[PDB]
Structure 1
Amino acid sequence: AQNPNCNIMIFHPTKEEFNDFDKYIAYMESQGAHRAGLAKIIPPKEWKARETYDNISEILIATPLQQVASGRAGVFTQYHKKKKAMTVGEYRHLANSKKYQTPPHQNFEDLERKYWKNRIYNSPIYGADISGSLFDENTKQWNLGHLGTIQDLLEKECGVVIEGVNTPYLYFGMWKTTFAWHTEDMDLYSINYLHLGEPKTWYVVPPEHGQRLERLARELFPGSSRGCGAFLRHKVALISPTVLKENGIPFNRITQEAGEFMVTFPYGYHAGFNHGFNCAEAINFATPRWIDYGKMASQCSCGEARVTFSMDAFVRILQPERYDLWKRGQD
């Protein structure tokens, strides 16, 4: 078995290997990359996502989200308070302000210490989940707006044609902006490209151990667990690396820098934080190996998780017994 300790693997594809996206994912899996739940891909030196980032300031962030924490430094939830619209240039100025900017630090490990010590005492503002793309249309390799769709994959594997669409999303971050512990909708893959700015630190639990994280979470968030049998689908709970280690939960960590891709694998729980002003693009995707995970994915039906239009067909075809209850949660 390849990668039996479930370490995060880093890949350096050549320009020739960067042509065929599906083939390269399958290659990474042949080497055991999926066992970690997360892999890093450093693009060939010849590649670029677009020519420059000099002209992005007028993108609108219609609903910036202030991430307000509750709990203790290593075990907390966050809620999202909606703020007034602002442009990317306005948001960048805000991220760089004395109130929000990255503190002085020695290295990524010092900054990570400072994040976990101090996160809960601040409420950073995240421009998340903005439909759109920063890849140039002429970028032919690893262009996250030009990937094979999940609907087409399901149709190819299973023969059933379904409604729905699959487009990327932009994320504008600042110091301390946080992504809570989660797997993707329907335990899909994700791919995330850090277009510009400061790094993103990731934490990940191997897919084979995801239920250990779920059992800890039920213990640490006992009210939430009574409310919903899949409350991590709400994407609000944070648990620090120190608390994971104290409870024997297997995990790994890695920092993504500008110009790098990350892939999350089916049922790989992940969480993390941004170091300072940045912009990332991400999208879900599927492969043949996903189908069995999609069939077994948990679902929130309490009403909290509310998701896209396109998840309806995935539930309906892959999980017909659960469909009626899940759809009630949607309505």
Structure 2
Amino acid sequence: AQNPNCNIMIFHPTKEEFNDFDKYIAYMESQGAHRAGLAKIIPPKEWKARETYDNISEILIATPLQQVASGRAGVFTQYHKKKKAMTVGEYRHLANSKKYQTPPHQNFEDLERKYWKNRIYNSPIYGADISGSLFDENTKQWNLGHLGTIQDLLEKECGVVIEGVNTPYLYFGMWKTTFAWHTEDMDLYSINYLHLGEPKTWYVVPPEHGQRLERLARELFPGSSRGCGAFLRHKVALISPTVLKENGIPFNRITQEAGEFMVTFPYGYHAGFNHGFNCAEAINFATPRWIDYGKMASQCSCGEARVTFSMDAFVRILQPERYDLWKRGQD
């Protein structure tokens, strides 16, 4: 078996290899990339997402979210407090203010230490889940707005026609903005492009050991776990690398920089944080190999997780037994 230690693999496709998205994802999996739960893809030097970012200030972040932490430094939950709308221009100025700017640091390792030591004592503001794309319509390769849809994949594999669409989202980050431990909805894949700005650090647990993470999480968040069998679906729990090592949870870390793609694989739990002002674009996708994961994916039916319109049909087709109970949590 390829990649038996489940290391995060980094790929450098040629412009010729960057032409066919599906084929390249299959190639990465033939090399064992999926075993890590996350891969990095460096685009060919010839490729560009768009010509410039000079005109992005006017995007509206309708609902900025302040991420407020409770708990201890290495084991905490965060909730999202809604703030008033601001433009990307205003957000970028806020990110760079003294209150919110990245602190002086020697290197990524020093910044990681400061994140985990001080994250809980501050509340950064995240512009998350904004529908839209920054890929130029004439960018033809790995354009996250022009991938084959999940609904077409499900139709090709299973012969059923369903409603729904699947479009990209933009994320505007600042120092300490955090993504909690999670898999994708229905354990889909994700692809994330860091368009501009400061890096994003990622932690990931190999899919083959996801249940060990979930067991630790049940122990670390005992109330949350009582309230919902799939409470990691709430996307609120953080667990530091130090705590993961103490508990023998296998994981890996890697830092994404601007111009780089990350791909998360089905049932790869991931979490991370942003180093400073940045903008990422992401979307979920499927391949034939996802279908079995989608069929076995855990679901939140407590009401907290509350997901897109498109997810209904995935549950309806792939998890018909779970559909009634799950939809009762959506209504």
* TM-score bracket, shorter-length normalisation: over 0.9
Measure how far apart 1:261 and its partner are.
Answer: 0.1
User: Equivalents in 2 of 1:63, 1:160: separation in Å?
Assistant: 36
Q: Deviations over 1:213-248 (max 9, x none)?
A: 000000000000000000000000000000000000
- After superposition, what is the alpha-carbon deviation per residue over 1:86-126, rounded to whole angstroms, capped at 9, x for unaligned? 00000000000000000000000000000000000000000
Residue in structure 1 matched with residue 281 of structure 2 by the alignment? 281
Partner of 1:329, secondary structure, is helix
Question: What is the TM-score when the length of structure 1 is the normalising length?
Answer: 1.00
The CA deviation string for residues 263-284 of structure 1, in whole angstroms up to 9 with x for no partner, is 0000000000000000000000
Q: Report the CA distance between 1:181 and its aligned residue.
A: 0.1
Give the drift of 1:136: 0.1
Question: Percent identity over the alignment?
Answer: 100
Any idea what the Cα deviations from partners look like across 1:268-304, whole Å, max 9, x if unmatched?
0000000000000000000000000000000000000
| 1:179 alignment counterpart | 179
Task: Tell me which residue corresponds to 1:170.
Answer: 170
Secondary structure in 2 matching 1:23: helix
TM-superposed deviation, 1:250: 0.2
Task: Please give the alpha-carbon distance, in whole angstroms, between the structure 2 residues aligned to 1:116 and 1:308.
Answer: 31
Counterpart CA distance in 2 for 1:58 and 1:281 is: 17
Q: Deviations over 1:3-44 (max 9, x none)?
A: 000000000000000000000000000000000000000000
CA drift of 1:190 comes to 0.1
Shift in Å, 1:144: 0.0
Displacement of 1:201 in angstroms is: 0.0
- Secondary structure of the corresponding residue to residue 145 of structure 1: helix
Matches within 5 A, 1:237-316: 237-316=237-316
Distance 1:277 1:187 in 2: 28
1:63-107 CA distance string (max 9 Å, x none)? 000000000000000000000000000000000000000000000
Shift of the alpha carbon at 1:317? 0.2
1:47-77 C-alpha deviation (Å, 9 max, x unpaired):
0000000000000000000000000000000
Q: CA deviation at 1:168?
A: 0.1
Supply the distance in 2 between the matched residues of 1:84 and 1:262 (Cα, whole angstroms).
30
CA distance in 2, matches of 1:7, 1:25: 17
5+ unaligned residues in a row in structure 1: which ranges?
none
Taking the aligned partners of 2:274 and 2:173, their CA distance within structure 1 comes to: 6
Secondary structure (helix, strand or coil) at the match of 2:145 reads coil
Unaligned residue ranges in structure 2 (runs of 5+):
none
Q: CA deviation at 1:154?
A: 0.1
1:323 Cα offset (Å): 0.2
Q: Which residue of 1 aligns with 2:79?
A: 79
Residues in 1 aligned to 2:86 and 2:118: alpha-carbon distance in whole angstroms: 26
Q: RMSD of aligned C-alpha atoms?
A: 0.2
Q: What is the Cα deviation at residue 252 of structure 1?
A: 0.1
Find the residue that maps to 1:315 and give its secondary structure: helix
Task: Provide the secondary structure at the position in 2 that maps to 1:292.
Answer: helix
Aligned length: 331
Residue 151 of structure 2 aligns to a residue whose secondary structure is helix
What's the CA shift for 1:207? 0.2
Cα distance, 1:180 vs. partner?
Answer: 0.1
Give me the whole-angstrom Cα distance separating, in 2, the residues matched to 1:236 and 1:104. Answer: 28
- Superposed, 1:201-212 pairs within 5 Å as 201-212=201-212
CA distance in 2, matches of 1:322, 1:80: 28
CA distance in 2, matches of 1:61, 1:310: 23
